[PDB]
C-alpha cells in the first residue's frame, strides 16, 4: 500500500512548494496519477485477500472504495477552485492540504489490517472534515453543523473504542484475519448485548441510521462543495465498511439485535424519501436522499446474506458517485444565483442544455434505472430482503416509488417549466463544470460492463 500512500503524502510538499498559480494544475495532475495507480488494487483473488504487509491488506470490499476515494480527490479539486479563486495562496494550500490529509487517512482506513488502527484512521478523518466544514463553509450555520457532525460521530465512536480494547484483552488480537479465523459465537447475555451495541453504534451513526441522522442535513448542506462531495461519497461508506468488517464477531447475536435497526431503517427510508418530496432546499433534498440509500445498505448488512452484502457494496459505490454528481450539479446553480432555494431558478433546460442533460443522467442514476449499478445494488438487497421476509417488498417498493417521485420532481422543478424572469446572470456552462459532470458520470456507466468490480468479496 506504500506505492499508493507515499505518492499521496508527496502531494503535500508538492502543493506547498508549487507556484501560486500552478496549485490546482499540480494537485489535479498528480491526484489523477495516484488514482490510476489505485486501479491495480482491483486485481483480487477468489478466496484470499491481498495481504501486503502486517499492517495493510486489500480485498474486493475495500479496493473499489480506495479507487472511489482516489478518484474523488481530483474532482474535489476541480469543484473547489471556482469558489476559492479569491482566496490567498496560503489558504488555498491549506484547503488542498486538508483534502490530501483526508484522502491519506481514508486510504489507510480502508486497508488497515488491525481494528484499532482502523479506529484511529477512521477517527482521524473527522479533523480535516471538520476544518473544511467550519472554516470554508459559507453560512453561519456551518459552526452548528460542525458541532453536530463532530459530537454525533464521537458519541458513537468512543464506546466502540472501549469495546475494541476489551475484545483485544479477551481474544488477544484485533487483527482482521485472526478475528475471522478464530471466530467465537456470541452468547445471549446483557454483557454481549452491550458489546454488540458498542461495536455497532459508531458505524450506525456514521451511515447514518434513521433517527441518528440529524447531523447529516446540516453537515452536507453547510459544507463547501468538496466537503459535501467527500461527506456524501466516502465518509458515509466508512460505517458500512466497518459494519461489514465487524459483524464477523457478532453472530448469532445479530439475528435479533438487528430487529430495531432493521425496523428503523426500513421505515426511515420511507420517511426520508417522503421528506425529499417537500424539501425547499436543493442541497438539503440531495442530502436527505443519502439517508434512504444508506438505510438500504443498513438493511443489507444487518441481514447478513451473500446477496445482501454484494448489493450493499455495489450500492455504496453507486451512491458515492451519484450523490457527489448531484451535489456538484446543485453547486453549479448555486454559484450562479448564490442561493440553494430550489424554485428560485426554474426552467434551466432552455438556458443550460448540456447541464440539463447532466441533470437528467444524475436523476436517472438516483432513480436506480437498470442496468445501472445503483439498480444492481438495490435489486440485490431487495431480493435478499424478500428472502428474509416477503413482507419487506411492500416497504422497498414504496421506497423506490417515492424515490422516483422526488428525483423526477427535482429534475422537473429545476430544469423544466419557464425560466425565472429577473434572473439574468445564468452564464454558459464552463468547460470545467461540464468536465466535472462527465468525470462523475462516465465511470459510473462503465462499471455496468464489469459489475463484479464493485460486488465485494462475496461475489
Amino acid at each position: 500500500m506504500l506505492k499508493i500512500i507515499i505518492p499521496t503524502t508527496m502531494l503535500l510538499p508538492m502543493t506547498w512548494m508549487s507556484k501560486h498559480n500552478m496549485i490546482w494544475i499540480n494537485a489535479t495532475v498528480h491526484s489523477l496519477l495516484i488514482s490510476l495507480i489505485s486501479l491495480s488494487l482491483l486485481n483480487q483473488l477468489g478466496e484470499n485477500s491481498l495481504n501486503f504487509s502486517l499492517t495493510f491488506f486489500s480485498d474486493s470490499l475495500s479496493a473499489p472504495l480506495l479507487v472511489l476515494t482516489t478518484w474523488l480527490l481530483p474532482l474535489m479539486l476541480m469543484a473547489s477552485q471556482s469558489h476559492l479563486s479569491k482566496e490567498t495562496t496560503t489558504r488555498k494550500k491549506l484547503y488542498i492540504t486538508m483534502l490530501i490529509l483526508l484522502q491519506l487517512f481514508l486510504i489507510m482506513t480502508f486497508t488497515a489490517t488491525e481494528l484499532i488502527l482502523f479506529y484511529i484512521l477512521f477517527e482521524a478523518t473527522l479533523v480535516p472534515t471538520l476544518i473544511i466544514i467550519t472554516r470554508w463553509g459559507n453560512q453561519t450555520e456551518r459552526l452548528n453543523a460542525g458541532l453536530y457532525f463532530l459530537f454525533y460521530t464521537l458519541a458513537g465512536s468512543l464506546p466502540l473504542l472501549v469495546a475494541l480494547v476489551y475484545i483485544q484483552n479477551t481474544t488477544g488480537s484485533l487483527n482482521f484475519l485472526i478475528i475471522h479465523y478464530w471466530s467465537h459465537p456470541l452468547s445471549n447475555s446483557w454483557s454481549n448485548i452491550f458489546m454488540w451495541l458498542a461495536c455497532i453504534m459508531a458505524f450506525m451513526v456514521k451511515m447514518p441510521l434513521y433517527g441518528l441522522h440529524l447531523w447529516l442535513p446540516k453537515a452536507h448542506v453547510e459544507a463547501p462543495i468538496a466537503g459535501s462531495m467527500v461527506l456524501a461519497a466516502v465518509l458515509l461508506k466508512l460505517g458500512g465498511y466497518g459494519m461489514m468488517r465487524i459483524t464477523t464477531i457478532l453472530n448469532p447475536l445479530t439475528n435479533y439485535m438487528a430487529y430495531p435497526f432493521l425496523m428503523l431503517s426500513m421505515w426511515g427510508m420511507i420517511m426520508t424519501s417522503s421528506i425529499c418530496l417537500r424539501q425547499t432546499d436543493l442541497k438539503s433534498l440531495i442530502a436527505y436522499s443519502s439517508v434512504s440509500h444508506m438505510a438500504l445498505v443498513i438493511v443489507a448488512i444487518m441481514i447478513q446474506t451473500p446477496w445482501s452484502f454484494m448489493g450493499a457494496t455495489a450500492l455504496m459505490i453507486a451512491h458515492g458517485l451519484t450523490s457527489s454528481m448531484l451535489f456538484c450539479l446543485a453547486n453549479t446553480n448555486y454559484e450562479r444565483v448564490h442561493s440553494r432555494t430550489m424554485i428560485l431558478a426554474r426552467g434551466l433546460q432552455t438556458l443550460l442544455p448540456l447541464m440539463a442533460t447532466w441533470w437528467l443522467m444524475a436523476s436517472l442514476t438516483n432513480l436506480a434505472l437498470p442496468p445501472s449499478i445503483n439498480l444492481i445494488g438495490e435489486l440485490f438487497i431487495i431480493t435478499a430482503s424478500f428472502s428474509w421476509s416477503n413482507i419487506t417488498i411492500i416497504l422497498m417498493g414504496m421506497n423506490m416509488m417515492i424515490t422516483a417521485l422526488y428525483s423526477l420532481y427535482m429534475l422537473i422543478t429545476t430544469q423544466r417549466g419557464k425560466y425565472t424572469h429577473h434572473i439574468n446572470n445564468i452564464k454558459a456552462s464552463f468547460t470545467r463544470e461540464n468536465a466535472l459532470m462527465a468525470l462523475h458520470i462516465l465511470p459510473l456507466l462503465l462499471l455496468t460492463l464489469n459489475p463484479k468490480m464493485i460486488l465485494g468479496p462475496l461475489y
Binding site: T55, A112, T113, E114, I116, L117, Q168, L174
Partner: protein
Amino acid sequence: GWVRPDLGELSKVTKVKTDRPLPENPYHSRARPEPNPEAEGDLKPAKHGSRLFFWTM
C-alpha cells in the same frame, strides 16, 4: 594489696573465658521467608516487539 585502677582502665572492654555455650538463637527467630527466585539467562529481543496493538516493532 589492692591497687586502685587508673583513669580509663575501668572503662576498658575486656574478655571473659566462660564455660556457658554461646546462645544459638537469642532472638527466638522464626525461619526467614524463602526469597523470590533470581533472574537467570541472557536478554533476547522482545518477540515480535512491543506487540502493542498494531505496532510491528
